[PDB]
RNA sequence: CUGAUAACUUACAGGACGCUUUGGCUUCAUUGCUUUUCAGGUGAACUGCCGAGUAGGUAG
């Protein structure tokens, strides 16, 4: 197992989220940020605490009232704007059927068999309804939904032949899973992701457009550059009409529409689907190779999971919930080679 | 204690204080300032922002947002101090509720403390704040020089028992929110000096400005209007005045810092006495000398908090 | 107070004739940088007059 050259190409390909300001004239301009320098006070722990005593008289009372400057990128909604409009395009494809490189046709046919068995027995509706719920509730705006009056999402699917799928105010209406399952906006766009994951050479391109009603001079929070190492908080930016504008990133909004993993030892909230179920806030990673629930301890028993998908009936504790994680990692994956 | 990764996110999100000049015709124009650059014979830029002649009055507009981002820490690192702080917050909420901090945070929003020096040589200034979510009219205030002065003047019938709740139910309830749209009308005299916020100039009086309708207007800061409504701290050894709720309690105009770790009242001697302050809030009775005064500061600093690392 | 004391190496010069380096080529899988911020004109360079004046001059 793990045959020294095993790679997968991803199945969900998002794009950058371009911010626009729409005025009461119903005309659009690119949202522009600026780099302002501000005077903070010395509030860091280890400017007046070595470990963990008290320092010499270099941290005196007169020397802790010396305001330290930062130069940070500030972006806000301009005065007299109607609302903010955020646009990106996501594409669901069928690149999880066959591995990209396999090296040995004993584990290749195993993985193609395993995906076909998962397709037939417990279908794509679970992962489709989870992946599409993170697009249609404005999860890819990350923090711009906190302290916003109301935000609406209009998405244009393809191939489509009808009206634009529109989810109105997504705080009162579309809270839980059952709110999403109404007539013209669920039955027909969950199918076309099932027929884009299960059908060979399948494709489903959605163009998503969200309208944010923020308060007066409200702070807009885009994605920041890494700064391979004064200037902390430098925003990622691209040029629209000869004006630089903040972008929110391509890879950040892939890590938004793929926060679905709540199948991990206990359960609290969805994590980003990794191998070692890493949590960002609580810096400790769950699904560690000790507990034996990581992707590599699961995939080593892939040939076991076919024996359970023979006939009636597969139990929904560590067969369905672990295969969900297996398929959720094949959709993202590359590469398991070692 | 201090587990090498303990950051919080701010609860109170203020916005830029946009100036507008209103005329006798009842139309609003952006306020404009000139820049006198000196050109010595063979850059020194000095700005002046005065109210123009024949103007009826001035209008200052900003939007403040009370959120519920003080319950859970942003990055905790260890799950031993996590339940400590969360327990300490809910015990504080249970024993001595958010009414006091809510009042202290709303009093210096509803009396024009965020204008800083525009209240100086001002006849009258009226504040109209629109809260959200709300079901009625605009909560409007009268002349704030004679009417609203002490705590008891603010505690009138239809304008205090309804907007302290929605701040109390913001800090308590998970993903709780309260967005106040504040508009203040300054009745300044003929050619009165308006004092906005100035830029750093790392090395004389260049103003901080943004573009409205294609012309530059002064702004009165984004952080100069959050550092005004968070002038609460008067729980430091003796008592003089409301300070900025900092870690080491730094006074700005006077250069020294009261509440300094030699005294042992800063937000590191108090944060490391958490295990004590869960024991004290168990049963009757908590004294208002060195417990409630410390817990108030602890929570006042947890609202501003980030980032506590060492 | 020196292997001490003393010391002219110099004239002249033609490297030239000739030259094909060439054939072929897939770098490609996966990706959250984020948390928090006061730059500070003490009152102070005024009030008039002439001028059609966002021009230009003037007294105190």
XYZ file of C-alpha atoms (C1' of nucleotides) in Angstrom:
708
model
C 0.000 0.000 0.000
C 1.032 3.663 -0.745
C 2.943 2.662 -3.929
C 5.740 5.384 -3.968
C 3.906 7.330 -6.815
C 0.157 7.930 -6.027
C -1.320 11.420 -6.819
C -4.916 12.774 -7.276
C -6.030 15.953 -9.151
C -8.707 17.997 -7.230
C -12.438 17.866 -8.247
C -13.609 21.356 -6.934
C -11.813 24.402 -8.536
C -12.882 27.790 -7.034
C -11.581 31.298 -8.033
C -10.797 34.768 -6.501
C -13.729 36.806 -4.955
C -13.644 40.316 -6.603
C -15.259 43.019 -4.338
C -17.298 45.853 -6.011
C -19.029 48.965 -4.482
C -22.541 49.645 -5.977
C -23.843 53.268 -5.574
C -27.500 54.510 -5.426
C -27.135 55.406 -9.202
C -26.896 51.572 -9.891
C -23.266 51.910 -11.188
C -20.302 49.774 -9.894
C -16.680 50.736 -8.953
C -13.845 48.479 -7.645
C -13.442 48.678 -3.798
C -10.055 50.432 -3.078
C -7.960 50.003 0.156
C -5.122 52.239 1.541
C -2.012 51.788 3.809
C -2.426 54.027 6.947
C 0.190 54.330 9.777
C -1.266 54.289 13.362
C 0.108 54.808 16.930
C -0.476 51.705 19.126
C 0.588 51.494 22.827
C 3.023 48.811 24.193
C 0.419 46.106 25.161
C 2.560 42.980 24.283
C 3.383 40.591 27.220
C 7.216 40.237 26.750
C 7.967 44.029 26.564
C 7.683 44.144 30.441
C 8.000 40.375 31.394
C 11.154 38.260 30.561
C 9.935 34.791 31.869
C 8.033 35.021 34.165
C 9.461 37.538 36.720
C 9.732 41.343 36.189
C 12.512 42.940 34.046
C 15.261 45.504 34.985
C 14.329 49.274 34.851
C 14.251 49.304 30.986
C 10.429 48.695 31.255
C 9.974 51.870 33.431
C 6.573 53.711 33.673
C 7.878 56.518 31.322
C 9.130 53.825 28.804
C 5.755 51.872 28.702
C 3.826 55.093 27.686
C 5.978 55.408 24.463
C 3.430 54.750 21.633
C 4.828 52.249 19.033
C 3.744 52.849 15.380
C 2.309 50.188 12.978
C 1.707 50.595 9.180
C -1.401 48.434 8.328
C -3.691 48.238 5.221
C -7.176 49.694 6.092
C -10.162 48.916 3.754
C -13.742 50.242 4.428
C -17.053 50.795 2.497
C -17.008 54.445 1.221
C -19.688 56.941 2.484
C -22.902 57.014 0.348
C -22.518 53.441 -1.101
C -25.736 51.344 -1.631
C -24.036 47.947 -0.888
C -20.952 45.717 -1.619
C -21.161 43.023 -4.397
C -18.773 39.969 -4.247
C -18.454 37.705 -7.383
C -16.570 34.367 -7.954
C -16.992 31.142 -10.058
C -16.715 27.493 -8.759
C -16.480 24.358 -11.023
C -17.356 20.750 -9.901
C -15.608 18.050 -12.075
C -15.165 14.190 -12.139
C -11.366 13.903 -11.404
C -11.831 11.556 -8.333
C -12.800 8.415 -10.413
C -9.245 7.553 -11.656
C -5.965 8.561 -9.876
C -3.593 11.041 -11.667
C -0.448 8.846 -11.195
C -0.860 5.238 -9.820
C 2.548 3.477 -10.528
C 1.100 -0.079 -9.860
C -2.267 -1.385 -11.294
C -3.060 -3.435 -8.096
C -3.959 -0.356 -5.874
C -5.311 1.723 -8.875
C -8.189 -0.749 -9.670
C -8.760 -0.971 -5.821
C -9.428 2.847 -5.632
C -11.587 2.861 -8.873
C -13.558 -0.155 -7.420
C -13.853 1.653 -3.994
C -15.255 4.917 -5.589
C -17.719 2.867 -7.790
C -18.865 0.940 -4.623
C -19.316 4.292 -2.711
C -21.219 5.765 -5.765
C -23.670 2.771 -5.889
C -24.274 2.075 -2.129
C -24.244 5.519 -0.307
C -24.606 8.146 -3.102
C -23.098 11.653 -3.648
C -26.175 13.459 -2.096
C -24.511 13.770 1.406
C -21.255 15.455 0.144
C -23.213 17.401 -2.593
C -25.699 18.852 0.021
C -22.700 19.683 2.356
C -20.477 21.264 -0.410
C -23.443 23.306 -1.853
C -24.653 24.491 1.650
C -21.219 26.248 2.146
C -21.690 28.133 -1.235
C -25.385 29.136 -0.650
C -25.028 30.545 2.969
C -22.093 33.008 2.334
C -19.461 30.935 4.257
C -16.787 32.035 1.655
C -17.062 35.719 2.865
C -15.568 34.353 6.182
C -15.977 37.447 8.500
C -17.844 40.084 6.324
C -21.139 38.262 7.319
C -20.487 39.180 11.034
C -21.847 42.774 11.612
C -23.800 42.821 8.264
C -27.544 43.839 8.122
C -28.523 41.288 5.385
C -26.610 39.414 2.595
C -28.271 37.752 -0.481
C -26.686 35.138 -2.871
C -27.695 34.833 -6.593
C -25.833 31.960 -8.403
C -25.979 31.177 -12.193
C -25.454 27.392 -12.742
C -24.264 25.741 -16.036
C -25.432 23.742 -17.900
C -28.782 25.454 -16.941
C -32.022 26.322 -18.875
C -34.336 28.472 -16.652
C -34.129 31.244 -13.958
C -31.158 32.390 -11.757
C -31.094 30.497 -8.373
C -31.556 33.227 -5.682
C -31.245 32.779 -1.860
C -32.687 35.946 -0.148
C -31.632 37.230 3.372
C -29.511 34.267 4.722
C -29.833 34.879 8.525
C -33.670 34.526 9.087
C -34.702 32.276 6.096
C -31.802 29.787 5.432
C -30.392 28.885 8.928
C -30.704 25.028 9.092
C -30.434 22.224 6.426
C -34.274 21.841 6.007
C -34.660 25.591 5.046
C -32.423 24.962 1.927
C -34.527 21.943 0.682
C -37.358 24.114 -0.880
C -38.637 23.921 -4.453
C -36.680 25.499 -7.395
C -33.245 25.922 -5.654
C -32.271 22.427 -4.213
C -33.763 19.383 -6.122
C -32.190 20.497 -9.496
C -28.702 21.892 -8.392
C -27.762 18.934 -6.032
C -28.480 16.705 -9.053
C -25.934 18.061 -11.673
C -23.273 17.761 -8.858
C -24.243 14.026 -8.448
C -24.077 13.787 -12.334
C -20.759 15.824 -12.299
C -19.061 13.485 -9.684
C -20.516 10.086 -10.903
C -20.594 10.629 -14.750
C -17.251 10.373 -16.691
C -16.086 13.775 -18.187
C -18.838 15.442 -16.024
C -18.798 19.250 -15.381
C -20.880 21.781 -13.333
C -19.806 25.512 -13.363
C -21.636 27.851 -10.875
C -21.059 31.671 -11.028
C -21.946 32.975 -7.489
C -22.789 36.686 -6.760
C -23.399 37.918 -3.139
C -24.784 41.385 -2.092
C -23.566 42.602 1.401
C -25.580 45.365 3.225
C -22.898 46.651 5.705
C -23.365 49.644 8.099
C -21.885 53.189 7.515
C -18.050 53.143 6.869
C -18.034 49.394 7.868
C -14.605 47.610 7.801
C -14.293 45.061 4.896
C -11.827 42.194 5.773
C -10.059 40.598 2.740
C -7.227 37.945 2.740
C -3.598 38.984 3.577
C -0.157 38.085 2.033
C 2.165 35.700 4.008
C 5.278 38.040 4.214
C 8.074 35.355 4.058
C 10.407 36.677 6.844
C 7.375 47.642 9.786
C 4.292 46.248 7.893
C 1.983 43.463 9.199
C -1.540 43.113 7.610
C -0.680 43.623 3.866
C -3.854 42.670 1.860
C -3.799 40.385 -1.232
C -4.810 42.603 -4.239
C -5.406 42.433 -8.050
C -5.960 45.239 -10.652
C -9.520 46.057 -11.952
C -9.687 48.963 -14.521
C -6.190 50.275 -13.494
C -7.243 50.338 -9.758
C -5.764 47.769 -7.269
C -8.596 46.039 -5.267
C -8.630 43.454 -2.401
C -9.303 39.854 -3.531
C -10.060 37.449 -0.523
C -7.988 34.758 -2.388
C -8.553 31.601 -4.532
C -7.225 29.021 -1.956
C -9.008 30.666 1.074
C -12.465 30.232 -0.653
C -11.516 26.576 -1.431
C -10.947 26.172 2.367
C -14.454 27.770 2.902
C -16.561 25.527 0.540
C -14.644 22.471 2.018
C -15.341 22.945 5.805
C -17.626 19.824 6.013
C -15.650 17.349 8.273
C -17.736 16.773 11.483
C -17.111 12.936 11.267
C -14.087 13.208 13.683
C -13.648 11.271 16.968
C -16.369 13.085 19.089
C -17.975 16.055 17.150
C -18.417 19.871 17.669
C -18.229 21.769 14.288
C -17.058 21.137 10.671
C -13.218 21.269 10.180
C -11.271 21.919 6.930
C -10.945 18.428 5.258
C -7.194 17.623 5.686
C -5.388 14.264 6.272
C -4.572 14.815 10.025
C -7.913 16.659 10.781
C -5.954 19.855 11.744
C -7.903 22.627 13.621
C -6.611 26.250 13.219
C -8.074 28.055 16.327
C -7.468 25.221 18.885
C -3.859 24.712 17.617
C -3.851 20.952 18.612
C -4.843 18.724 15.596
C -7.594 16.055 16.079
C -7.563 12.890 13.845
C -3.808 12.418 14.752
C -1.982 9.197 13.594
C -2.158 7.924 17.284
C -6.035 7.632 17.345
C -5.834 5.860 13.901
C -8.514 8.068 12.193
C -6.103 10.046 9.858
C -6.308 9.508 6.031
C -3.276 7.080 5.889
C -4.511 4.729 8.728
C -7.940 4.675 6.880
C -6.582 4.153 3.278
C -4.324 1.206 4.444
C -7.683 -0.638 5.164
C -9.276 0.503 1.798
C -9.277 -3.190 0.609
C -11.257 -3.993 3.870
C -13.980 -1.310 3.157
C -15.007 -3.128 -0.137
C -15.695 -6.389 1.872
C -18.344 -4.435 3.954
C -20.009 -2.954 0.751
C -20.874 -6.516 -0.551
C -24.632 -6.566 0.376
C -27.067 -5.581 3.243
C -26.360 -3.783 5.482
C -23.462 -1.281 6.123
C -23.486 0.300 9.654
C -23.401 4.158 9.999
C -20.768 4.528 12.830
C -17.203 3.901 11.381
C -18.018 2.528 7.822
C -20.126 5.431 6.331
C -18.559 8.258 8.488
C -14.936 7.084 7.663
C -15.635 6.478 3.896
C -17.200 10.026 3.802
C -13.732 11.279 5.017
C -11.942 8.954 2.476
C -14.015 10.373 -0.483
C -13.834 13.977 0.946
C -9.963 13.557 0.817
C -9.992 11.966 -2.737
C -12.019 15.058 -3.978
C -9.233 17.411 -2.619
C -6.258 15.077 -2.724
C -2.677 14.793 -4.086
C -0.317 13.203 -3.160
C -0.135 10.110 -0.825
C 3.183 8.755 -2.216
C 5.807 8.679 0.670
C -0.029 30.645 32.536
C 0.282 32.607 29.199
C 0.314 29.501 26.913
C 2.460 30.964 24.004
C -0.679 31.562 21.760
C -3.706 33.359 23.394
C -5.347 35.894 20.972
C -8.903 37.415 21.174
C -11.009 39.382 18.590
C -12.550 42.843 19.410
C -16.328 43.000 20.276
C -16.841 46.792 19.607
C -16.234 47.632 15.864
C -16.486 51.457 15.403
C -16.318 53.256 11.969
C -14.976 56.604 10.546
C -16.689 59.836 11.859
C -17.669 61.492 8.493
C -18.237 65.328 8.702
C -20.991 67.186 6.717
C -21.915 70.954 6.585
C -25.738 71.635 6.490
C -26.898 75.043 5.061
C -30.030 77.216 5.630
C -31.316 75.640 2.309
C -31.233 72.207 4.165
C -28.685 70.440 1.846
C -25.546 68.536 3.087
C -22.036 69.263 1.596
C -18.702 67.577 2.561
C -16.421 69.738 4.834
C -13.169 70.799 2.993
C -9.759 71.930 4.461
C -6.817 73.863 2.840
C -3.033 73.058 3.169
C -0.483 75.948 3.622
C 2.936 74.532 2.483
C 5.810 77.015 3.261
C 8.236 77.698 0.347
C 11.438 79.158 1.957
C 13.499 81.494 -0.329
C 16.915 80.501 -1.854
C 7.805 69.248 3.181
C 6.422 71.662 5.891
C 2.628 71.227 5.199
C 0.218 72.842 7.791
C -3.598 72.203 7.437
C -6.561 74.376 8.681
C -10.213 73.061 8.854
C -12.716 75.860 9.839
C -16.574 75.851 9.430
C -17.363 77.961 6.288
C -19.317 81.305 6.520
C -23.173 81.161 6.375
C -23.332 77.437 7.432
C -26.439 76.443 9.532
C -24.665 73.656 11.556
C -22.337 70.556 11.262
C -23.368 66.818 11.217
C -20.918 64.034 12.353
C -21.972 60.440 11.335
C -20.442 57.033 12.375
C -21.720 53.417 12.933
C -20.686 51.319 16.040
C -21.265 47.486 16.197
C -21.405 45.556 19.558
C -20.663 41.795 18.933
C -20.227 38.527 20.984
C -16.491 37.708 20.326
C -15.366 37.682 24.051
C -16.851 34.199 24.963
C -14.391 31.930 23.007
C -10.661 32.804 22.506
C -9.458 33.088 18.828
C -6.335 30.818 19.186
C -6.020 29.229 22.716
C -3.243 26.580 22.019
C -4.041 24.706 25.335
C -7.531 23.363 26.389
C -6.802 23.926 30.162
C -6.931 27.818 30.187
C -9.771 27.676 27.530
C -12.518 26.368 29.926
C -10.903 28.618 32.669
C -11.619 31.880 30.697
C -15.027 30.587 29.321
C -16.071 29.507 32.911
C -14.764 32.891 34.294
C -16.889 34.786 31.632
C -20.162 32.796 32.289
C -19.591 33.012 36.131
C -19.090 36.845 35.762
C -22.254 36.933 33.514
C -24.198 34.862 36.163
C -22.997 36.700 39.360
C -22.593 40.426 38.307
C -24.217 40.981 34.847
C -23.140 43.137 31.834
C -25.401 46.160 32.843
C -22.414 48.130 34.365
C -19.989 47.777 31.359
C -22.971 48.248 28.920
C -23.888 51.567 30.725
C -20.173 52.707 30.849
C -19.763 51.838 27.073
C -23.114 53.513 26.016
C -22.757 56.692 28.238
C -19.621 57.861 26.255
C -21.473 57.049 22.939
C -24.642 59.051 23.967
C -22.846 62.288 25.196
C -20.389 62.997 22.267
C -17.085 61.912 23.957
C -16.001 60.606 20.455
C -15.843 64.268 19.144
C -12.878 64.801 21.619
C -12.483 68.657 21.244
C -15.433 69.707 18.917
C -17.671 70.003 22.086
C -15.283 72.860 23.213
C -16.846 76.292 22.269
C -20.104 74.549 21.100
C -23.594 76.078 21.836
C -25.516 72.724 21.629
C -24.980 69.224 20.092
C -27.903 66.723 19.613
C -27.213 62.929 19.161
C -29.710 60.728 17.183
C -28.631 57.009 17.190
C -30.645 54.347 15.229
C -30.186 50.901 16.901
C -30.627 47.482 15.130
C -32.504 45.209 15.468
C -35.192 47.836 16.449
C -39.033 48.136 16.000
C -40.106 51.816 16.459
C -38.533 55.298 15.832
C -35.042 56.954 16.120
C -33.717 57.279 19.752
C -33.045 61.086 19.718
C -31.373 63.196 22.495
C -31.914 66.909 23.457
C -29.101 69.524 24.093
C -26.340 67.488 25.924
C -24.915 70.253 28.201
C -27.887 71.016 30.597
C -30.062 67.828 30.160
C -27.813 64.665 30.112
C -24.800 65.049 32.525
C -24.901 62.345 35.316
C -25.941 58.611 35.143
C -29.527 59.376 36.426
C -30.257 61.905 33.562
C -29.585 59.094 30.967
C -31.951 56.702 32.922
C -35.199 58.271 31.494
C -38.288 56.227 30.390
C -38.172 55.489 26.610
C -34.380 55.749 25.833
C -32.253 53.560 28.262
C -34.136 50.390 29.510
C -34.458 49.249 25.796
C -30.901 50.003 24.335
C -28.833 48.636 27.344
C -30.741 45.384 26.656
C -29.653 44.356 23.070
C -26.084 45.186 24.380
C -26.650 42.905 27.470
C -28.280 40.311 25.077
C -25.340 40.890 22.600
C -22.475 40.037 25.078
C -24.561 37.105 26.563
C -26.156 35.411 23.454
C -23.890 33.431 21.006
C -23.340 35.389 17.690
C -25.302 38.271 19.377
C -25.193 41.627 17.482
C -26.166 45.336 18.009
C -25.384 47.887 15.179
C -25.996 51.543 16.328
C -26.042 54.250 13.553
C -25.025 57.452 15.510
C -25.557 60.977 13.975
C -24.519 64.077 16.066
C -25.533 67.696 15.072
C -22.908 70.298 16.287
C -24.239 73.930 16.569
C -20.770 75.631 16.298
C -20.342 79.460 16.106
C -19.286 81.487 12.965
C -15.854 80.195 11.672
C -15.357 77.702 14.584
C -12.128 75.567 14.609
C -12.951 71.859 13.803
C -10.205 69.470 15.149
C -9.999 66.159 13.183
C -7.391 63.321 13.617
C -3.785 63.838 12.290
C -1.393 61.379 10.476
C 1.784 59.936 12.154
C 4.603 61.715 10.153
C 7.512 59.360 11.166
C 10.733 61.514 11.365
C 3.569 69.583 11.224
C -0.263 69.007 11.530
C -1.185 67.084 8.309
C -4.862 65.945 8.774
C -6.249 62.385 8.244
C -8.756 62.615 5.299
C -10.847 60.408 2.900
C -12.582 61.155 -0.482
C -16.392 61.906 -0.462
C -18.047 62.821 -3.857
C -14.549 63.253 -5.462
C -13.314 65.810 -2.808
C -11.209 65.157 0.377
C -12.887 65.551 3.849
C -11.444 65.153 7.409
C -12.222 61.834 9.216
C -11.513 62.085 13.066
C -9.742 58.646 12.855
C -11.089 55.046 12.938
C -9.121 54.175 16.178
C -9.475 57.734 17.632
C -13.280 57.054 17.827
C -12.903 53.525 19.407
C -10.353 54.868 21.987
C -12.960 57.555 23.051
C -15.960 55.193 23.771
C -13.500 52.835 25.654
C -12.385 55.530 28.226
C -13.862 53.533 31.200
C -11.025 52.495 33.621
C -11.318 54.328 37.022
C -10.523 51.181 39.164
C -6.714 51.886 39.545
C -5.106 52.096 43.012
C -6.678 55.445 44.218
C -8.823 57.233 41.494
C -8.362 60.389 39.274
C -10.135 60.041 35.845
C -11.421 57.539 33.217
C -8.324 56.039 31.412
C -8.087 53.975 28.160
C -8.720 50.273 29.166
C -5.143 49.076 28.303
C -2.935 46.235 29.707
C -0.587 48.522 31.778
C -3.206 51.385 31.986
C -1.189 53.916 29.873
C -2.188 57.640 30.190
C -1.521 59.511 26.857
C -1.342 63.329 27.552
C 0.481 62.698 30.889
C 3.349 60.401 29.713
C 3.459 57.998 32.785
C 1.378 54.749 33.148
C -0.789 54.092 36.286
C -1.745 50.393 36.975
C 1.942 49.329 36.414
C 3.285 45.790 37.265
C 5.358 47.164 40.270
C 1.902 47.919 41.878
C 0.560 44.557 40.506
C -2.822 45.813 39.102
C -2.021 45.385 35.308
C -3.576 42.656 33.020
C -0.893 39.990 33.851
C -0.995 39.992 37.734
C -4.881 39.866 37.416
C -5.058 37.356 34.442
C -2.733 34.925 36.393
C -5.143 35.267 39.438
C -7.998 33.670 37.332
C -8.096 30.433 39.472
C -8.649 32.708 42.570
C -11.460 34.741 40.837
C -13.478 31.521 39.984
C -13.241 30.556 43.745
C -14.401 34.099 44.874
C -17.491 34.118 42.493
C -18.705 30.718 43.968
C -20.979 31.981 46.842
C -21.719 35.163 48.941
C -20.289 37.751 49.074
C -17.929 39.494 46.536
C -16.537 42.878 47.783
C -16.390 46.039 45.536
C -12.818 46.961 46.747
C -10.340 44.527 44.997
C -12.671 41.830 43.391
C -15.532 43.497 41.358
C -13.153 46.423 40.421
C -10.612 43.774 39.128
C -13.284 41.566 37.367
C -14.690 44.755 35.649
C -11.130 45.587 34.343
C -10.524 41.873 33.379
C -13.725 41.862 31.191
C -13.114 45.494 29.971
C -9.655 44.184 28.771
C -11.095 40.847 27.364
C -13.484 42.997 25.146
C -10.407 44.886 23.684
C -8.230 41.719 23.924
C -5.589 40.333 21.491
C -3.018 39.123 21.733
C -1.767 37.724 25.012
C 0.937 35.478 23.669
C 4.360 35.428 25.269
C 83.075 47.156 12.185
C 78.733 42.934 7.530
C 82.134 35.386 2.830
C 84.681 42.836 4.583
C 87.140 46.500 1.028
C 86.518 47.286 -5.640
C 82.707 46.275 -9.886
C 78.420 48.662 -16.912
C 76.793 42.174 -20.188
C 75.717 44.234 -25.201
C 74.519 44.426 -30.130
C 70.409 42.149 -34.855
C 65.558 39.681 -35.691
C 58.283 38.599 -40.152
C 55.141 32.248 -37.552
C 52.395 31.513 -41.307
C 49.300 28.974 -45.182
C 43.607 25.706 -44.878
C 38.860 24.428 -42.121
C 30.410 23.003 -41.523
C 30.035 20.092 -35.133
C 24.992 17.850 -35.778
C 20.216 14.643 -35.028
C 15.851 13.830 -30.815
C 12.898 15.649 -26.243
C 5.698 16.891 -21.777
C 7.972 18.885 -15.010
C 3.090 18.028 -12.499
C 0.264 16.577 -8.531
C -2.057 19.515 -3.203
C -2.378 24.528 -0.315
C -6.685 29.714 5.005
C -1.246 33.895 7.388
C -4.215 35.831 11.380
C -5.333 38.208 16.293
C -4.945 44.314 19.008
C -3.946 49.803 18.149
C -5.430 58.149 20.074
C 0.010 61.528 16.804
C -0.353 65.887 19.882
C -2.838 73.383 16.609
C -4.207 75.425 25.399
C -6.893 80.847 24.415
C -3.834 82.250 19.953
C -2.196 86.435 12.974
C -7.463 90.863 14.295
C -11.136 94.960 12.568
C -11.991 98.126 8.926
C -11.712 101.083 3.951
C -11.316 101.441 -1.822
C -12.518 98.092 -5.596
C -18.328 94.861 -10.616
C -14.323 91.044 -8.114
C -12.918 83.926 -5.330
C -8.385 90.083 -9.570
C -5.733 93.789 -7.000
C -4.695 97.564 -3.440
C -4.827 99.937 1.371
C -4.866 101.815 7.085
C -4.432 100.943 11.925
